[PDB]
Amino acid sequence: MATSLIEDVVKKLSVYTELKVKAEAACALRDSLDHYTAGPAYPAFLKKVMPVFIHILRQQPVFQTTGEQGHMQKLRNCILEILHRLPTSQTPPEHFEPYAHEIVDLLLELVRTDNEDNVILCVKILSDIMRHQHKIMSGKVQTFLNLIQELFEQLDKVVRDQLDNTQANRLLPRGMYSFKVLAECPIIVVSIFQVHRSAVTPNVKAFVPLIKSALLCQAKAQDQAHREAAARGTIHIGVSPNIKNRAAFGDFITAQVKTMSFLAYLLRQYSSQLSDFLPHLPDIIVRLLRDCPRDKSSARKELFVAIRHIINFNFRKIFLPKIDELLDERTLVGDGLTVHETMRPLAYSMLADLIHHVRDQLSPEQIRKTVEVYTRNLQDNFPGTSFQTMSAKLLLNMAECIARLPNKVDARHYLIMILNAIADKFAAMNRQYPNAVKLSKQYAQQAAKNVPETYLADKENPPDWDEIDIFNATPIKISNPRDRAADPVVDNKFLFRNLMTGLKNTFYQLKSCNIPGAVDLTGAPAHWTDVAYGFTAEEVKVIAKLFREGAYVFRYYEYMANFYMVSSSKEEKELLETFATVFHCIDPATFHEVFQQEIPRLYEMIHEHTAL
Amino acid sequence: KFIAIINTINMLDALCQFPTANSQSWLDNKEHIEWLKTVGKELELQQKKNSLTPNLRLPAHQASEQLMNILTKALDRNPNDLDALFSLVEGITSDDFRETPALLSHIYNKIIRSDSIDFWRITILRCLDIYSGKTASQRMKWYLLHNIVNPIIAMDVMRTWDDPNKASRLLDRTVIDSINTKIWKVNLPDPQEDLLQPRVDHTRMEVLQLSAMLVKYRHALLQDARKDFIKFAWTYIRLDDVINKHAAYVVIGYFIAHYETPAKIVSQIYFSLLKTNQNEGRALVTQALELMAPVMPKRCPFPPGDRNPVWALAPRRILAEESQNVQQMTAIFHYLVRHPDLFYDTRDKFAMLIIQCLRKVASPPNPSNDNRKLALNMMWLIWQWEQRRVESKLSAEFQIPSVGRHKMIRYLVEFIAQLNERYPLPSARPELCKKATALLYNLLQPQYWGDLVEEMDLFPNVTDLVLAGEKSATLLSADPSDPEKCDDKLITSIINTLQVVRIVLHFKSDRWILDNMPQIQKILEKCLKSANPEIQDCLHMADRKYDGDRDVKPTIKRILDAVPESELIAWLSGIATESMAAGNYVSGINILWSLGHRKPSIIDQHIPAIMRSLQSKLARDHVSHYAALGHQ
């Protein structure tokens, strides 16, 4: 404990080498506070360190960060860190309560006057003090509210200075003119609102114009780039090359998305006040999605969560005109590798939810584009199956709304296209059977071994690869299958079950699209009156391919009396019955001409899977 | 015109479905292929817009597939003509045609499976030439690297896994020099400005994958290019893309594990890896750390007699600095759990941290499975350290204070009590729990912390709230048939708590049990009267099969043996009498079994009740059921 005493006396008698030693000792004390944070000596250290910190902090701000300037900057930083790191909880034996006014006032003045690296820490410390020392402090929150309102007011002017009116040796701007500090405001404001509830009613009204103005802000270069792209008929995505400071633009976009998240949070209860601002919201959302730099994946994820939150509050009806724009992949995702590799399922799931909740008022073009996009999504080669299942279930749900279009030609075409997509997926699944079996066996053996896995060439593991594997044989792994704990056979069976269950509903919806008077039905059996009619030669091919590919996927479930449950299982038998039932719903002539052609291939297939 | 195009495509496709006629020679002509490509592009453009009559949509959709198949069939003849292949790939990656599995199915089975080291080097060199040029867009370069170059090298690696240190006759000096000069030696004048193009990150990832594969599988061939490889990998560290940055870290880790590097770079990379906070690319960070860790003692030697390595002090510093963010702590603990031997020496600066942070990692209210697993793994790491210490001593060592041991024991007891999975028992109606119980048993051994059990009570708060609580008492005393009073979680908690008290009492002394009898009676009276077979199974049964290779005596037998050769015997006899009177045979028969095994002289006054039960209910139902089965 002699080190602390000697450091304290040295600091007291103070009022490069000396400054270096003082800073080193102070930051070592900050590190070792863990051994001193708990105990009844907190008042002594607090009172013996407050005067020196107050005296030192009163000095003029320092912009330079070299030599003595950098040393004193680090000294101040690692001295201020104690207050945030200190356990300032509201516990009964708290000793910091009676001495908060002077310190919080000085910190507020510093925030008003200090630089970014200092003001950010100062506001964090102010928030942590606010969360705890509100018991006697509660008489001065008005100053903080006014300060944050002034920051929001001056956000526009600082943006104008940065863009319109515009490391060691760099001059540090004042904290009032930074975007990083601005982006931190919303969370602190939310925490302050949560803490106290007696000074909230007027502040919402005060902020509403400010948040509206903040969201309406825009940059001239990006605006003109968008306008010229629209004039050319295309869409501009990314950051305009004319921008001179890309980091500033990225921070500005981050602040904008943080403000959007704050608006979404406020919308939970005070939607009545934002009813005037609602109409322009989708345009701002689309512009933010288009303007987000491809490097900032976290900001895009936050924007996606904010969009989901706004959607779930039954404010979805205002998104209809922009659904067509939201369906483009350039606007939704962009060109970044991280986004395309990690966040595609989330974006497409939220878009699917929005579309499903509004399906009853979709124009034909929107239906066509959605069918195109999600048929493309179903055929994706994502490692898992949840993405494909989501796409398939959306298509199945949209079948009913497709069947209600005024034009029956388009409805029949779209339903046939969905059936074609399902047949293609069946063929793709058939292509992967041996690889799935091999991978299941290998994973079972690896799990049995129970040995830690090394990413090193090992002679005990010969590299067996085939058509499917050889294209994914590189060493770097983005996501290990071990964490997922997935077996390809099980996932394929799950997807197969879902698609087979949906087939019947799709066929039923198709049954009620017959073009009146297209084909004469003067005399038909009572068993053949409600079936689908009017297939051309190109649709019989789709039906035959559907049967051919579907029948061959039952290998995944691997004499015939089977009086007791043997060979096949109950699930397989019910799936087979469901598959067979689907073909009762078409023209008898089509049935004849399909199965006449298909019987020999079915005969061949039975020799490899006797349950057929 | 589009009807004519569709009909022509249909006829030409039909003409090539029976290749066993040597009639495919019309596919050798080039002008026909150019005309086909032109008409195909026209039709594809018409389909892209909705500018076709509604009568020709499906026919055109099928015509596109037929045309792609025709082009692939033409490509199949003369597989060595790479100009045709590159033109087709340019068309496909430029959004002019629609892809079909045939192109990849031909690339495989013609190029990748080629049975000649010739035509592999030429293909790789041509692909690298295209990549080096500034004309082949970005998707074409990615396609080539992903689908031709890397698979060829993988096939070469697979085909030469032989004992006699077989070399790679494919990877000659020319190939290595070309790769180095075209990728590694290329010091970009402004690579940060190269990002202005789209889709460049994917090809950057492809080149990173190629470099990583080379280092992993043919490390012996990079002796003259070690320096250039290090410079290239260090340069790629600056990319703004998270995935690219972590892939570069993985490449650096591979080189470090396979080559000698100055300790400064290794320490810098270690500090950068341990300081990462972004949740994205956690697996890449894990892979890099696993690659780097095993070679730390060799890469960063420390003076003999020193037990504070820099590579060991770095995690301590990061934990101290970033103790506020929970993700940092979780990541460092995940790293630490995997390497017990490495930190065996420096445990003196981590045991207390782990013990105090165990509560932080997992919270009583509702933690996730991963948090519970991590906490259990931390406790297992401490157990491994202690076991290693004791084994080394047997064949001034740092020891935890009694406060830490006490706190860890309380946390473990609460964790076991509040766990989700249920203890396996024979009476159960038709891993974490087993591991936790085994750890608890192992810790309390005499040579181990077992010396702390003398002053350890029965954890009054948890034991009371989970056994003597009114809700617990009424649920346990309720009818097992009713699902309303069959809350699975509560019964699981009771079973786990009973196992805990059994284990602790197994290690207690006779004097302590004798003195504290009334507390034990208060804690066990409610459960001893239960009609649930599983509670009685916990109380009376002790089987090696379900105890995980442990010899722990039943709690009832333990307390009965504690009695000198009393009040406990009379009290148990009273419970047995009151249970048998009401017809609750599950409790009475089990208690009487225990009592008789203790001292037979107590069953003389109970013989009539046992006989009455046998002739009334049990045997009657047994024989009646078997008679019914025979009749059926």
Side-chain angles (χ1 to χ4, degrees):
Chain A
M1 197 33 183
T3 48
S4 182
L5 290 163
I6 189 140
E7 202 294 320
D8 296 346
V9 302
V10 168
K11 197 162 184 159
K12 268 139 78 164
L13 69 93
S14 309
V15 300
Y16 191 77
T17 306
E18 221 206 354
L19 292 317
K20 180 107 190 72
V21 175
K22 287 163 185 180
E24 288 163 339
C27 305
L29 169 57
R30 185 219 67 196
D31 305 3
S32 87
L33 262 164
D34 47 302
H35 299 101
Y36 321 130
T37 41
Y42 183 27
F45 301 117
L46 175 65
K47 76 184 190 76
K48 87 197 298 306
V49 304
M50 272 210 273
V52 289
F53 298 166
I54 286 151
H55 161 87
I56 289 153
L57 290 159
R58 276 173 200 181
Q59 296 197 10
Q60 46 70 64
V62 166
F63 296 94
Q64 305 167 17
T65 65
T66 40
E68 262 87 342
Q69 307 113 37
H71 280 333
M72 61 75 53
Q73 273 286 70
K74 190 247 185 184
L75 179 137
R76 276 215 274 200
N77 281 240
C78 93
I79 275 154
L80 268 281
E81 182 160 18
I82 75 197
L83 300 104
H84 178 29
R85 278 282 299 287
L86 267 161
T88 51
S89 47
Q90 291 168 244
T91 60
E94 61 186 327
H95 323 104
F96 193 85
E97 215 193 334
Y99 298 86
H101 308 267
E102 47 255 47
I103 182 58
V104 297
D105 273 344
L106 174 53
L107 215 48
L108 183 70
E109 297 306 327
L110 291 163
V111 166
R112 285 271 293 181
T113 61
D114 286 32
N115 315 48
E116 290 75 26
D117 49 5
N118 294 37
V119 299
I120 184 62
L121 268 71
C122 283
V123 297
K124 283 286 201 81
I125 294 149
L126 281 167
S127 66
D128 71 35
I129 283 155
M130 227 37 78
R131 181 58 168 289
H132 287 147
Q133 301 298 344
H134 62 81
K135 294 199 172 183
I136 185 52
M137 191 282 330
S138 309
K140 60 170 57 47
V141 301
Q142 318 103 302
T143 61
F144 288 68
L145 276 307
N146 200 334
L147 172 53
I148 58 176
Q149 289 170 349
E150 166 53 25
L151 264 299
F152 273 123
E153 291 163 349
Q154 71 90 25
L155 84 84
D156 50 25
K157 91 162 145 62
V158 63
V159 176
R160 189 194 275 88
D161 168 48
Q162 283 265 7
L163 315 182
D164 248 17
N165 304 8
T166 189
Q167 191 270 118
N169 56 0
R170 92 199 182 290
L171 185 66
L172 208 62
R174 199 180 154 200
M176 267 265 171
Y177 302 112
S178 187
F179 286 123
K180 273 176 280 296
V181 68
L182 174 52
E184 199 81 22
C185 295
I187 195 75
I188 300 151
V189 172
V190 169
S191 315
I192 280 156
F193 286 154
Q194 182 271 357
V195 166
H196 80 264
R197 304 220 61 72
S198 49
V200 286
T201 53
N203 296 78
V204 179
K205 291 105 181 139
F207 279 127
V208 163
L210 291 167
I211 188 162
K212 198 238 185 179
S213 84
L215 291 176
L216 207 77
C217 187
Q218 188 157 359
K220 53 158 195 325
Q222 195 88 21
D223 201 2
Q224 65 185 116
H226 284 173
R227 281 217 310 279
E228 63 183 292
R232 285 188 177 178
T234 72
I235 298 293
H236 172 75
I237 299 109
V239 181
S240 190
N242 290 7
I243 299 289
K244 180 144 278 275
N245 211 235
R246 55 193 64 156
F249 177 60
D251 197 8
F252 183 25
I253 298 303
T254 326
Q256 296 239 56
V257 57
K258 284 279 173 68
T259 304
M260 177 81 61
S261 60
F262 181 58
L263 188 137
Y265 148 79
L266 269 172
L267 200 71
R268 62 190 64 251
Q269 286 290 310
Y270 269 60
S271 55
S272 44
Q273 317 312 338
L274 302 140
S275 288
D276 58 345
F277 184 55
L278 70 78
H280 320 310
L281 192 64
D283 201 302
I284 307 308
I285 272 158
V286 160
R287 205 204 47 236
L288 273 154
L289 263 187
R290 256 176 244 179
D291 283 322
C292 213
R294 30 168 273 191
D295 164 48
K296 306 274 192 67
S297 39
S298 59
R300 201 186 271 287
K301 205 186 171 296
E302 268 227 335
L303 183 47
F304 286 144
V305 186
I307 275 144
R308 257 286 297 191
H309 276 319
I310 303 169
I311 279 280
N312 68 27
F313 290 140
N314 311 354
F315 294 120
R316 59 184 81 87
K317 62 221 165 287
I318 52 159
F319 276 109
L320 269 72
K322 306 290 169 179
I323 278 166
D324 164 331
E325 306 196 285
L326 273 163
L327 275 161
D328 199 30
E329 79 193 35
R330 278 171 293 154
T331 294
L332 207 65
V333 163
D335 301 75
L337 171 57
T338 313
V339 183
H340 164 268
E341 215 82 352
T342 51
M343 313 167 24
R344 267 199 287 153
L346 168 71
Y348 278 114
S349 295
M350 61 144 270
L351 180 61
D353 219 281
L354 160 58
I355 280 159
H356 174 73
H357 277 331
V358 152
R359 76 197 169 287
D360 178 33
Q361 33 270 27
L362 279 174
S363 84
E365 269 57 12
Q366 301 174 332
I367 303 203
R368 186 181 64 74
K369 210 178 170 191
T370 65
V371 168
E372 170 224 318
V373 169
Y374 277 89
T375 40
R376 190 151 49 212
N377 279 353
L378 168 62
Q379 304 299 338
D380 217 277
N381 234 32
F382 213 53
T385 287
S386 38
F387 196 52
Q388 287 83 13
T389 305
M390 164 208 86
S391 310
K393 86 174 283 193
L394 177 54
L395 288 167
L396 298 192
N397 285 351
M398 286 270 292
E400 168 113 8
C401 95
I402 284 161
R404 269 195 314 255
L405 286 176
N407 202 337
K408 305 316 206 183
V409 172
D410 291 10
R412 267 179 82 86
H413 185 55
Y414 301 148
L415 292 155
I416 297 289
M417 284 338 274
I418 287 163
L419 288 170
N420 191 55
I422 290 171
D424 282 346
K425 185 53 168 184
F426 282 167
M429 273 153 90
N430 270 323
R431 224 131 52 208
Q432 288 152 3
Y433 173 76
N435 191 74
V437 166
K438 184 197 82 174
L439 255 49
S440 271
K441 235 166 284 300
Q442 196 216 94
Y443 290 174
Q445 297 310 69
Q446 173 261 304
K449 286 170 197 186
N450 273 313
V451 175
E453 186 239 7
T454 319
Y455 316 94
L456 252 50
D458 217 40
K459 290 227 163 168
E460 287 142 314
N461 292 121
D464 256 351
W465 293 312
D466 57 47
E467 320 197 39
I468 314 293
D469 293 322
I470 206 88
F471 295 97
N472 306 298
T474 52
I476 302 162
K477 309 300 188 199
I478 310 310
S479 65
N480 195 298
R482 282 178 58 194
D483 281 37
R484 308 181 220 148
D487 179 21
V489 174
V490 173
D491 310 33
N492 275 351
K493 279 198 238 186
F494 188 66
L495 186 62
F496 186 60
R497 201 193 342 159
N498 288 125
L499 300 164
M500 211 51 94
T501 294
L503 226 58
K504 166 55 188 190
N505 186 55
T506 296
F507 257 100
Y508 165 91
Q509 286 308 318
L510 186 82
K511 259 190 278 210
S512 92
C513 271
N514 293 350
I515 282 66
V519 86
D520 169 27
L521 298 200
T522 314
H527 272 129
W528 298 106
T529 321
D530 83 321
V531 302
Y533 275 105
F535 299 92
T536 72
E538 279 78 23
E539 283 130 32
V540 183
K541 274 156 61 55
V542 177
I543 300 158
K545 162 166 61 54
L546 181 80
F547 177 80
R548 193 168 47 240
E549 299 300 339
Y552 209 35
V553 195
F554 280 93
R555 283 171 305 156
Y556 276 94
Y557 288 71
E558 54 80 18
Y559 293 75
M560 198 217 158
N562 284 233
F563 297 147
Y564 185 82
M565 291 276 134
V566 290
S567 301
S568 33
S569 65
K570 282 294 216 176
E571 169 57 290
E572 198 195 350
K573 309 241 189 102
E574 85 103 27
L575 256 186
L576 280 156
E577 274 171 39
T578 302
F579 188 53
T581 291
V582 169
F583 298 94
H584 285 243
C585 320
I586 68 190
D587 192 354
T590 309
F591 184 95
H592 296 151
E593 71 191 339
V594 152
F595 281 100
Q596 198 147 20
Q597 163 181 326
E598 282 298 311
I599 179 152
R601 176 58 181 139
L602 173 63
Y603 178 67
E604 282 148 15
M605 270 182 311
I606 283 170
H607 281 285
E608 326 181 43
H609 194 70
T610 319
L612 280 174
Chain B
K1 47 144 77 154
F2 303 122
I3 299 171
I5 288 158
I6 284 151
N7 284 346
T8 312
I9 286 161
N10 216 351
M11 269 164 251
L12 289 174
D13 187 74
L15 281 178
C16 80
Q17 297 312 306
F18 292 83
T20 48
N22 78 264
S23 53
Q24 308 285 52
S25 316
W26 67 276
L27 288 174
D28 294 346
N29 191 314
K30 316 304 288 136
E31 268 63 359
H32 297 158
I33 309 307
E34 308 324 310
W35 178 84
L36 270 169
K37 287 179 168 200
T38 312
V39 291
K41 276 171 54 45
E42 179 32 291
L43 191 77
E44 276 280 3
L45 206 158
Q46 291 295 315
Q47 287 170 91
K48 190 174 139 164
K49 321 280 178 291
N50 220 13
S51 55
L52 280 181
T53 55
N55 198 225
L56 297 163
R57 298 187 273 197
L58 195 47
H61 169 97
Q62 301 179 339
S64 300
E65 298 179 293
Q66 275 168 345
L67 181 43
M68 205 62 223
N69 291 0
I70 277 163
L71 292 177
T72 294
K73 217 99 88 188
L75 218 69
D76 166 28
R77 287 161 70 81
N78 288 288
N80 308 264
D81 206 39
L82 264 39
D83 286 86
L85 179 66
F86 291 158
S87 45
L88 201 52
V89 169
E90 183 295 278
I92 274 165
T93 56
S94 188
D95 211 47
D96 287 323
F97 307 133
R98 272 210 318 271
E99 205 172 357
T100 293
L103 180 56
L104 201 91
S105 184
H106 147 85
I107 282 164
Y108 193 96
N109 296 306
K110 290 289 131 187
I111 293 121
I112 288 156
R113 277 225 290 140
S114 200
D115 207 306
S116 90
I117 300 282
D118 321 277
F119 185 48
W120 275 9
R121 207 179 289 106
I122 312 152
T123 317
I124 279 165
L125 289 152
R126 268 205 80 163
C127 282
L128 281 159
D129 283 334
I130 307 207
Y131 163 80
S132 170
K134 74 293 293 173
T135 77
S137 79
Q138 281 297 321
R139 284 192 54 196
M140 219 189 139
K141 298 159 172 269
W142 176 93
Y143 194 99
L144 294 191
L145 280 164
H146 190 281
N147 286 291
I148 294 145
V149 163
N150 294 1
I152 273 161
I153 290 154
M155 191 55 134
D156 183 72
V157 164
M158 180 188 353
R159 255 181 211 176
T160 66
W161 259 55
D162 227 334
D163 174 29
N165 72 293
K166 300 286 216 182
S168 58
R169 55 205 65 81
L170 165 67
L171 294 154
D172 274 20
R173 295 284 283 96
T174 180
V175 176
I176 310 278
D177 260 340
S178 45
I179 273 168
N180 161 250
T181 36
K182 284 173 181 295
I183 307 170
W184 297 330
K185 267 168 76 134
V186 169
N187 296 311
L188 283 309
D190 190 313
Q192 305 299 125
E193 272 198 350
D194 307 358
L195 190 134
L196 302 159
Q197 293 194 354
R199 312 284 295 188
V200 65
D201 301 319
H202 304 70
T203 182
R204 296 223 186 93
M205 188 84 201
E206 278 309 299
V207 299
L208 276 160
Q209 292 271 31
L210 174 71
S211 309
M213 161 156 279
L214 282 173
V215 164
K216 183 185 161 163
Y217 275 106
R218 318 290 220 200
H219 49 268
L221 281 51
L222 277 54
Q223 301 294 351
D224 299 3
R226 304 175 46 262
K227 201 76 153 50
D228 301 335
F229 196 111
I230 275 302
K231 281 280 144 269
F232 148 86
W234 182 270
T235 46
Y236 266 56
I237 285 292
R238 284 137 83 270
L239 289 176
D240 269 90
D241 214 68
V242 182
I243 302 292
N244 297 147
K245 189 180 253 162
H246 296 351
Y249 275 126
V250 167
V251 165
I252 270 166
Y254 263 111
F255 184 91
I256 277 160
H258 280 277
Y259 284 93
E260 321 316 275
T261 315
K264 176 253 193 189
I265 294 106
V266 183
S267 59
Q268 234 168 323
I269 291 330
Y270 195 48
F271 215 111
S272 307
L273 276 161
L274 281 167
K275 186 136 299 195
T276 303
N277 59 300
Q278 299 146 320
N279 59 60
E280 266 131 29
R282 274 273 97 205
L284 297 167
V285 178
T286 293
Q287 176 172 11
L289 276 163
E290 293 312 301
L291 276 162
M292 269 173 22
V295 297
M296 212 81 102
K298 192 170 197 177
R299 289 281 171 285
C300 279
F302 47 96
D306 196 347
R307 312 184 164 196
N308 308 319
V310 174
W311 48 267
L313 293 175
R316 173 74 204 88
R317 296 255 295 287
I318 295 164
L319 166 66
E321 285 168 31
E322 283 184 333
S323 187
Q324 185 62 27
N325 180 291
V326 298
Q327 285 85 335
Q328 302 293 125
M329 308 189 31
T330 293
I332 59 174
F333 289 140
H334 265 282
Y335 175 53
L336 248 58
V337 154
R338 249 175 243 131
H339 302 279
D341 276 40
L342 191 83
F343 304 102
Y344 172 45
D345 284 305
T346 175
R347 89 194 146 251
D348 40 12
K349 204 86 170 175
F350 281 126
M352 223 80 225
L353 262 299
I354 297 159
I355 282 159
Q356 319 159 291
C357 291
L358 267 160
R359 212 80 76 92
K360 287 181 201 177
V361 182
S363 72
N366 267 334
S368 81
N369 292 37
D370 311 278
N371 284 8
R372 304 155 103 90
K373 188 94 167 69
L374 185 56
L376 191 58
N377 279 335
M378 288 151 94
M379 311 210 243
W380 207 263
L381 167 77
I382 277 159
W383 155 244
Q384 268 170 328
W385 278 345
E386 288 261 305
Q387 175 173 252
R388 174 80 157 194
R389 179 281 281 310
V390 167
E391 98 192 5
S392 60
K393 181 175 182 182
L394 168 58
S395 306
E397 301 290 345
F398 176 75
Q399 67 187 6
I400 303 163
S402 90
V403 187
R405 309 163 159 215
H406 266 126
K407 220 199 223 210
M408 202 187 140
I409 290 287
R410 333 209 155 91
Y411 175 66
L412 181 50
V413 163
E414 304 224 359
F415 171 83
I416 273 169
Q418 310 228 270
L419 194 46
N420 296 333
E421 296 159 30
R422 191 184 296 195
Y423 199 90
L425 299 150
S427 314
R429 172 185 295 284
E431 327 91 0
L432 294 195
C433 198
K434 295 161 76 76
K435 212 158 172 185
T437 52
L439 177 71
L440 178 56
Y441 175 91
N442 292 127
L443 265 202
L444 299 180
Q445 304 284 55
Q447 66 280 63
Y448 298 115
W449 301 353
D451 324 316
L452 177 137
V453 307
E454 306 164 351
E455 54 266 49
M456 158 180 342
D457 60 11
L458 253 54
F459 307 94
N461 49 87
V462 165
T463 200
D464 181 293
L465 61 88
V466 79
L467 291 168
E470 178 56 40
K471 170 159 68 179
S472 205
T474 183
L475 191 129
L476 171 132
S477 286
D479 221 319
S481 57
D482 197 338
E484 283 188 333
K485 295 288 178 287
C486 204
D487 216 6
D488 313 54
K489 262 287 160 66
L490 197 60
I491 275 162
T492 312
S493 34
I494 312 202
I495 281 157
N496 296 336
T497 323
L498 287 168
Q499 294 300 330
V500 179
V501 316
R502 164 177 166 207
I503 282 163
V504 48
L505 269 186
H506 162 91
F507 285 112
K508 278 291 197 170
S509 89
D510 46 47
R511 283 294 313 133
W512 187 93
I513 299 197
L514 281 169
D515 282 309
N516 297 266
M517 278 286 345
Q519 295 144 44
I520 297 158
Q521 317 203 181
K522 162 60 189 179
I523 288 202
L524 297 171
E525 181 224 338
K526 317 309 176 300
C527 293
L528 270 169
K529 303 195 224 298
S530 50
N532 192 30
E534 305 211 42
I535 307 302
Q536 302 290 355
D537 191 307
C538 284
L539 273 153
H540 301 284
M541 173 225 99
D543 191 277
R544 181 82 94 109
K545 182 193 201 228
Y546 302 87
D547 285 0
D549 265 17
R550 276 142 47 210
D551 301 62
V552 177
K553 330 208 311 208
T555 166
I556 294 282
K557 162 162 194 199
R558 256 293 306 183
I559 61 174
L560 281 172
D561 299 337
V563 166
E565 54 160 69
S566 171
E567 296 86 340
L568 175 59
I569 288 153
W571 175 51
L572 284 169
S573 318
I575 314 202
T577 319
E578 83 101 34
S579 291
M580 285 295 259
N584 178 36
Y585 299 131
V586 167
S587 174
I589 300 284
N590 272 281
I591 298 157
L592 277 167
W593 195 71
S594 275
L595 272 163
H597 266 282
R598 169 51 170 160
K599 179 140 67 70
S601 306
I602 294 89
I603 321 310
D604 309 278
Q605 49 142 327
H606 290 102
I607 287 327
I610 303 155
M611 206 54 57
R612 172 161 47 251
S613 76
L614 276 171
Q615 328 177 86
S616 52
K617 189 68 171 140
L618 302 173
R620 294 207 97 264
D621 296 316
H622 196 80
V623 199
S624 81
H625 151 83
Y626 270 115
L629 179 57
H631 282 135
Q632 294 283 317

